[PDB]
Amino acid sequence: DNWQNGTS
Amino acid sequence: DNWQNGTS
Amino acid sequence: DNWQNGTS
Amino acid sequence: ESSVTLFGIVDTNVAYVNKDAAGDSRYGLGTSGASTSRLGLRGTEDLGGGLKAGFWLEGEIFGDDGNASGFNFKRRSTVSLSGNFGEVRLGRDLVPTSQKLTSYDLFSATGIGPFMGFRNWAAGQGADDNGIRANNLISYYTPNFGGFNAGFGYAFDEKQTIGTADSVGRYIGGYVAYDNGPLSASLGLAQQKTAVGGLATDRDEITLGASYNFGVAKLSGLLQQTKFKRDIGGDIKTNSYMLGASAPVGGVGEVKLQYALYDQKAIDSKAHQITLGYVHNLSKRTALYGNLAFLKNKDASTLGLQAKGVYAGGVQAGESQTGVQVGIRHAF
Amino acid sequence: ESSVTLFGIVDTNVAYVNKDAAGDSRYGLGTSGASTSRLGLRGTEDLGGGLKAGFWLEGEIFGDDGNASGFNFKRRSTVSLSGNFGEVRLGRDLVPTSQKLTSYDLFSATGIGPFMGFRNWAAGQGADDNGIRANNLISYYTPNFGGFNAGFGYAFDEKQTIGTADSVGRYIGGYVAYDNGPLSASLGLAQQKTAVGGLATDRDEITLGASYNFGVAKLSGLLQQTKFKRDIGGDIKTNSYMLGASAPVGGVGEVKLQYALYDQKAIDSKAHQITLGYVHNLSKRTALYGNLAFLKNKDASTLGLQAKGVYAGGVQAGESQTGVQVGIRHAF
Amino acid sequence: ESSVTLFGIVDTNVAYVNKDAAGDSRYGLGTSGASTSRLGLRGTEDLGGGLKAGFWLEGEIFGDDGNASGFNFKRRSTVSLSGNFGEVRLGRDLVPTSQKLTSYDLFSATGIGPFMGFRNWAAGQGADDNGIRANNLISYYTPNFGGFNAGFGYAFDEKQTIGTADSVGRYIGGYVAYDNGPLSASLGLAQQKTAVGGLATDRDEITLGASYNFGVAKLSGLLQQTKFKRDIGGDIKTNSYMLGASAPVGGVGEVKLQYALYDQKAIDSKAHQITLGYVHNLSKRTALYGNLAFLKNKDASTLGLQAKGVYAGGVQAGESQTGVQVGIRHAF
Ligand SMILES: [Ca+2]
Ligand SMILES: [Ca+2]
Ligand SMILES: [Ca+2]
Ligand SMILES: [Ca+2]
Ligand SMILES: [Ca+2]
Ligand SMILES: [Ca+2]
Ligand SMILES: [Ca+2]
């Protein structure tokens, strides 16, 4: 998985 | 680079 | 967005 | 269906109150006027068969001082399993009563405008005598079936002892609710163990909340009774009432108005509050906002507006206080 | 071949011990029963020619209280260079002796079940008198050539002074080992400088560990002597012994059993421990687990099980203590 | 044009000074010799029309002790809006005067080599009496038009009271500058409110900096006067001077040399410093470095080299001190 921000 | 999780 | 490192 | 997310909000403001506990004005750079500033990590892992494992680690950000007292994960630090049965969470979090009932506050339980019912009315000596979060918490949340939904929590005291209380920090509580989209209503009941002046005390709380979103505007309200009942006798009882409305303005804008009353029986005194808010969205992530509040204490009441990072103390008995916050909220 | 990784583990449990130092039971929500809960960032940068630069920043997570005392990177905070020569690391980390020898503990050096040899047997006054980690550490790890491998570390005291000790915190230590996959064996030797009751004291430790993985089951053991030798005379010496076995059960499951003996010469007393563990994997990342331990103190011994976040203190002299942990471990 | 970035630097070193305040040598593992070690998150969100929203949360890393005193965001914790008008930032950050003027220091304002002008010369009692950062800060930075650029900041005191000072922590300050690529020059002026020995005091600072990058080498310098002027009378005034040069060596290398003089008028004493530095880049992200410094105190001066994590205290009056740092800097 790659880390996403809050809004995807 | 994009940040990955522990299991890649 | 995916989180990037310092050097992009 | 698995993911990991690093997220947050920086909400910083200029703020002013016309009086503090000495009667002097204060102004400065504060935080968290529209949403609580935060930094967190969360994830969901699909385990198959509709079962998911989750984690969530979130702490408050204080942009005016760079988290000078140190960063933590006190907002939420859970691990969970969820599925068609609902969700079970282990770890520090909002207790189910506050998680559900604070949703009725139009000011998102932050800034100068919000409902003040969830507070430590009795100077209880526990870590979380505002009834908002608990250490050592296990919670269970049902699915929503035909609108109906419920939540339950138990937090272990672990023999925390203060004076004659040997179960400080225990929580037992839950809610039942109906949520169909436009209509929401909930009833929460909770008891915490605490101490006041070193004497064992129960913190009992019953809360009713309801709202209806008409689209052109939303109406919302809360009713709460909080009673700190000392084992040897005596009680500090507070009845808190709120009614509010919000409406979109011009696409991109939102206006909010909330009225509250706090009836503090132990000092036979009332306080009344009126707050006006505006939010102007520059994007889905970025908003400029303003809050204007007026708090009127009667008699012995000394309640103050919560201008976090500027002044959040009390005022002199029977004084009225005016506050303003203007800021920017940026989610990431 | 370069990357950056944000990773962690949330391991939270319910736990119980039947007695504390007053003889009362305790139960609650604890942490880190199967693996230590953590949050970290690490990276490897390919520099060319087989040379790599690394960093690693990791701190413990306490999900029961949201890291109430503040988040740090005390588990590891290193920068390193690695290559065909091995690896050199600068910064706080496990010292080589503990890094290698704790691998023989089937309970991953956490929870109620693990080997207790790496502990502060003498009430030394240094920061790390359990022999696990050091501040100000430089370490060198060789490659594994034909099975053989070694590690060496030096940690600077920086003139830390407590009473008559002016080099508190110094570490010098290392190990030699053989690791071929199924077979592992290691010998570690270390000395730290410390103080006990304000008097300069050496903490000397020799540790032997071995294991063999038969596939159907693994056998593992540890032997250690720890001696706190006070410069003016006198010593607190402890001999610690452990033997354990683990086996896969049904695909997805694992059972573990460990027996330990702690021979505390300064109080002429022994303690014996037996721990049974089960791990049930829901996925590679998510496991449910249970630990059951029985600790028998003889004579003046007062050792207690380490139910982190519930109770990890001692018990009354010569008492037996039973503990249980049941929880979930989620890696990300 | 929107992004989010997680970034940092681990810079750890071995360091030595030949004397401390008792005249004894000290050596150990320290940090931040070439660049300050840090961990941060930042982002930029394109709002349309050239308008952008930003956030930036950054704290110092201490790799020798794993951030033992707890991680924070004290380096910077801002939210901002930027556009063709320039940039406005809210939150703790470098004040504009230090942000701009420290750029003239060839040692990046860290390690044993840097300019020491931004320091608490008077033992002021404020949080930031080195003039580097401020709590409660609002800053405005202009665009660069034809080389010319400026910055302005105001930090709220919020009635912080120490003795007779009731506005401790106030900052007002700014700079004007010219920057065309090879040539840079700036003039900064600032005033902070503080207290010394409980008596209200102004911290006044004027700083001039200039540099020229010839390509084969760069010349840079700083001049500063810092005056702590006590309201009832009296002042602690310091004039600080620096001249430095750097040059690339062999591709991959860089040599630096800086000379400084600190004229401490309140004790009628001077200190002189000479520092030699080398940086060897293994990659754009990873460098090995060495610093060698010699600090000569005259008369009553007691200044010490800043070997962070080893020794950064003073020395005996009129003593000379030699220091060395050798380390690795890894950016991510
Ligand atoms: Ca969760
Ligand atoms: Ca503030
Ligand atoms: Ca490393
Ligand atoms: Ca912290
Ligand atoms: Ca607990
Ligand atoms: Ca910013
Ligand atoms: Ca150090």
Domain borders along chain E are 1-332
Task: Return phi, psi of residue E309, to 5°.
Answer: 85, 0
Could you tell me if D30 and D323 are in contact, meaning their C-beta atoms sit under 8 angstroms apart?
no
For residues D321 and D15, give the distance between their C-alpha atoms in angstroms, rounded to a whole number.
13
- H-run or E-run covering F134: strand F133-134
Classify residue D293 as exposed, middle or buried by CB count within 10 Å of its CB (0-12, 13-18, 19+). Answer: buried
User: Residue F321: helix, strand or coil by DSSP?
Assistant: strand
How do the residues of chain E divide into helix, strand and coil, expressed in percent and rounded to 5?
5, 60, 40
- DSSP secondary structure letters along E34-76: SS--EEEEEEEEEEETTEEEEEEEEEE--TTTTSTT-----SE
Nearest to D284 among A2, A5, A7 (CB): A7
Q: Could you give the CA distance from residue E69 to residue E55 in angstroms, rounded to a whole number?
A: 25
- D147: its two tokens: 């609108």
**Residues E21/E316, Cβ–Cβ less than 8 Å:** yes
F2: its two tokens: 């929107």
Buried/exposed D251-270: b ≥16 CB within 10 Å, e otherwise:
eeebebebebebbbeeeebb
Instruction: Using CB atoms within 10 Å of the CB of residue F198, give its burial: 0 to 12 exposed, 13 to 18 middle, 19+ buried.
Output: exposed
Q: Which two tokens stand for residue F136?
A: 């409660």
Q: Quickly tell me which residue has 């050496």 as its tokens.
A: E202
Q: Which residues of D touch F92 (CB under 8 A)?
A: 63-66, 68
3-class DSSP state for residue F201?
A: strand
DSSP class per residue in E233-262: S-EEEEEEEEEEEEEEETTTEEEEEEEEEE
Please classify residue F66 by burial: count the beta carbons closer than 10 Å to its beta carbon, then call 0-12 exposed, 13-18 middle and 19+ buried.
buried
Nearest CA distance, E107 vs chain C (angstrom): 34
Spatial distance between the Cα atoms of F179 and F143, rounded to a whole number of angstroms: 11
- Determine the Cα–Cα distance for residues F273 and F193; give it in Å rounded to an integer: 30
Our CA-based measurement puts residue B5 at a distance from the nearest CA of chain D, in whole angstroms, of 7
Give dist(CA E134, CA E146) in Å, integer.
30
Ligand closest in space to the Cα of D74: 4
Distance CA A6, CA E307 (A): 35
Report yes or no: E105 and E210 within 8 Å, Cβ to Cβ.
no
**Which residues of E are less than 8 Å from D57 in CB distance?**
8, 10, 39, 61, 63
Taking each continuous run of H as one helix and of E as one strand, the counts in chain F are: 1, 19
How far, in Å, are C2, D36, E298, E325, F155 from residue F170 at the CA level?
Answer: 39, 26, 64, 53, 5
Contacts of D233 (CB under 8 A, 6+ apart): none
Interface test with D, best of E286, E288, E311, E325 (most D CBs within 10 A): E286
Cα separations in angstroms, E153 against D326, E104, E190, E192, F327: 54, 20, 9, 11, 17
- Separation CA E5–CA D97 (nearest Å): 37
Residue with token string 């950000």 = D61
Please state how this structure was obtained.
X-ray
Query: What are the phi and psi torsion angles at E164 (to 5°)?
Result: -85, 0
Are F5 and C5 within 8 A, CB to CB? yes
Touching subunits of C (3+ CB pairs, under 8 Å) are A, B, E, F
Q: Please identify which residue in the block is written with the tokens 């039973």.
A: E322
Q: E170 — phi, psi (to 5°)?
A: -55, 135
3-state secondary structure of D166: coil
Using CB atoms, which residue from E6, E29, E309 is nearest to D138? E29
Beta bridge partner(s), residue F255? F247, F278
Contacts of F4 in chain C (CB under 8 A): 1-4
Q: How many other CB atoms are there within 10 angstroms of residue F1's CB atom?
A: 8
Long-range contacts of F128-132 (CB under 8 A, 24+ apart): F128/F169, F128/F171, F128/F192, F129/F192, F129/F194, F129/F203, F131/F95, F131/F97, F131/F98, F131/F190, F131/F192, F131/F203, F131/F205, F131/F226, F132/F94, F132/F95, F132/F98, F132/F102
Three-class SS state of D70: coil
Separation of alpha carbons B2 and E214, rounded Å: 40
How distant is the Cα of B1 from the closest Cα of chain D, in angstroms? Answer: 16
Pairing of strands F26-31, F38-48: unpaired
Q: Could you count the other beta carbons within 10 Å of the beta carbon of residue E21?
A: 13
Is F185 in contact with F192 (CB distance < 8 Å)?
no
CA F212/CA F221 separation, integer angstroms: 10
Q: Name the helix (H) or strand (E) containing E101.
A: helix E96-101
Look at F283 and E47 and tell me if their CB atoms are within 8 Å: yes
Give the Cα separation of E269 and E271 in Å (integer): 7
> 3-class DSSP state for residue D242?
strand
CA distance E298 to E286: 38
Distance CA E71, CA E84 (A): 35
Strands (DSSP E) along E250-331, which ranges? 253-264, 269-281, 286-297, 320-331
- Give the other-Cβ count within 10 Å of F107's Cβ: 22
Contacts of C5 in chain E (CB under 8 A): 4, 43
End-to-end CA distance of chain B: 13
Structure tokens, E101: 């020898």
Q: Cα distance from B8 to chain E (closest Cα, Å)?
A: 8
Fold of D1-332: Porin (2.40.160)
Distance from the first to the final alpha carbon of chain A: 13
**Chain C residues close to E6, C-beta within 8 Å:** 3
- Cα F312 to the center of its chain, rounded Å: 15
